[PDB]
Each structure stands twice: as C-alpha cells, then as structure tokens.
Ligand binder design. Structure first.
Ligand code: CMP
Ligand code: CMP
Ligand code: MN
Ligand code: MN
Ligand code: MN
Lengths: 176, 176
C-alpha cells in the first residue's frame, strides 16, 4: 500500500464524520491504523533551501502505533518517499550535520483505512477541522494519469464531492 | 558498541594476518560479522559541498549479515554517526531529491570483532591489501585523547606497529 516514489491523491474537508464513517462502511473499508497522534517535525536549511525547491522533509512520530518515518516530499505535490527509522534523534542529528534543522511542527490525529488498492486517510487538526484523502502510491511516473483519474472515480463513488476539495497541504493551510 | 557521535579510530596496514588472527583467539574476541562483502556508495552534491566541509556520506550494504547503514562522517576528524536503514535504494532516492548523488563506490571484505570496549575490523581491498581498524565510539569529547592512546596500545597487542599506521582513508588511497 505504500510502495513507490509518487503518491497520487485527492483531499477533501469533511463536514460530517458520522456520514464519512457510513461512507467507509458502504465501501467495506478495513482499518490500517486508527486514531494516531502524528507529530511532524519539518526540517530545512538556514535559508529555507528545500522550501524554495518545493521540497518538504519531515521526521514523523506516530503514537501509539510507535512508527517513526523519515519523509521527503516534492519537488511539488506528487513526489513522496518515506523510510522507516528506529531512532528519530539519531537521524535528526545526522540531518543537522548536513545543515537541516527543525523549522516548524505540524500535529494531527490520523486514521488510515484501505479499500482495495486505495488508502483513505482521515485527519483532524486543531484549528482547521477534519479532512479525508483518497490516495494510491506508484513507482511509475508513466501511470500518474491513469491513477489520478482512478482516484477521482473512487472519490465520486465514495461520496466525496468537488465542493469540499482542499488542494493545499497542511503546511500551506497553516502558513509554514 | 556503536553508540556515540564520535569515533576514535586507528588504521594499520596488516603485514602479518596470522598473528592478528592468533591474537583474536588469545583475547577471546567475539565475531560481530565475519567475511562480509561491503559495498559503500559515497554520496555528495554536484559542487562537492560535503567534501568541502570534510564530510563523507555513505550508504553501506553488508552481506550476508544483511546490515544496511546510512553513515555521516565529519565534519572533520573523530565525528561519525550512523543509522540502520531497511533499504539502500530508498534512502539513496531520498537523498538524491535533496541533491546528493553517487560519487564513487568502494568495495571490501570486512570482519568485525569486539574485544571488551573496542572493536577491531579486518579489511581486504582488492587493489590495496590488508588493513585493520581499531576503534571505539563515544558521545563524550573529553576522553578522545585517552581513547586514541588506548587504541594504539590495544593494536600493538595484535602485532600492529606505529610504522604501519595508515592515516589516509580508503577514499584517499583509491584516488577519490
Ligand atoms: N507505516 C506508514 N504509515 C503511514 N504512511 C506511510 C507508512 N509508510 C509509508 N507511508 C507513506 O509515507 C507518506 C508520507 O507522507 P503522507 O503522510 O502524505 O503519506 C504517507 C504514506 O503514503
Ligand atoms: N550495526 C553496525 N554495524 C557496523 N558498524 C556500525 C553499526 N552501527 C554503527 N556502526 C558504525 O558506523 C561506522 C561507519 O564508519 P566505519 O566503517 O569507520 O565504522 C562504523 C561503525 O563504528
Ligand atoms: Mn498524503
Ligand atoms: Mn499516504
Ligand atoms: Mn567503526
């Protein structure tokens, strides 16, 4: 479910969580991980070198699931790779040696469900409210066309509507 | 054994592999890895930004132990940190996004033994020959001189003498 260098996705504001849960049930979604607090530390160079290239780099800690991820997103909104790491402070030290330092933090509550090849991620952020994203990862850039159309078809059958679309990232929404 | 951000290390050309091995037995060394093939991919920015800071960055694969490491050495002498990684190609792709690309590769056969607080590495490099590294990692900068002198004593005890000390790195010896 998380294999590749590209994450094809469509994100929406969710206005009613009960209806979302019903939409999930209707699609026979299965739970991957539920109700994790994710703390994302974003790193960048002193002169915001990565952000100036549309790149974000995150050390993510997920609790209680215990997962820790090193994530590089971009350039732009499709490219996304992650590596499991065992020791966040060790990787953060190593990145600091290379000149990347904590820039800001984004926290959220996240649940991830699966329906066939798709993953559905349901997020809550304090100022901002609830979001749901339909996504699929691929290693093959030639496919991004097919897959984005497929995401749209699934979003449509699921019940997630264009009026509620939210194209911006959390760092864009929060002003980072 | 591999805890810290400093590594104190002395490397020697090995003139007498038999004595070295005989002493590993005498001193009841424990084998951590034996006769592994190690392939080290060195990475740097196009402008050699890391070398200009006396930083080296390596992705190492050791077989058959299946250990994979991301290693950042430097800046300058005695600084070294490493992280276990699941997948070299994944980390390599992530670092390429940040601007670090393969510069050259070094291969060697390496065995790693522990004796008390020390580790001793016995290396063979096709063009170059046989070497041994005597090393210890620490987080404490206040003991580095003592540790280095202890490494030299310990090395003499395996038949490794000051006149066979080799200050150049493998990258230097191989013209990289
Ligand atoms: N264990 C995991 N849990 C959640 N996402 C993961 C995991 N492993 C890899 N990923 C992927 O890494 C990506 C990092 O950015 P996203 O949160 O947008 O989406 C994430 C997933 O596609
Ligand atoms: N699991 C491990 N196996 C081997 N070396 C390790 C491990 N974890 C950390 N290291 C250190 O990473 C260093 C990388 O550079 P060296 O080969 O000189 O010495 C290595 C060890 O001191
Ligand atoms: Mn996503
Ligand atoms: Mn995802
Ligand atoms: Mn070592």
């Amino acid at each position: 479910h998380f294999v590749g260098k590209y994450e094809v996705e469509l994100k929406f504001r969710v206005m009613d969580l009960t209806t979302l849960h019903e939409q999930l049930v209707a699609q026979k979604a299965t739970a991957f991980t539920l109700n994790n607090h994710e703390k994302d530390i974003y790193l960048d160079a002193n002169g915001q070198d990565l952000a100036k290239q549309q790149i974000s780099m995150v050390l993510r800690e997920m609790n209680p699931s215990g997962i820790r991820l090193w994530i590089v997103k971009g350039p732009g909104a499709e490219r996304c790779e992650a590596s499991n790491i065992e020791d966040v402070s060790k990787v953060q030290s190593m990145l600091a040696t290379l000149g990347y330092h904590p820039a800001f933090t984004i926290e959220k509550q996240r649940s991830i469900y699966f329906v066939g090849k798709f993953h559905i991620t349901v997020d809550h952020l304090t100022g901002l409210g609830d979001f749901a994203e339909i996504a699929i990862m691929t290693d093959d850039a030639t496919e991004l066309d097919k897959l984005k159309a497929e995401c749209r078809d699934f979003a449509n059958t699921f019940g997630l509507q264009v009026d509620q679309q939210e194209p911006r990232s959390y760092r864009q929404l929060l002003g980072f």
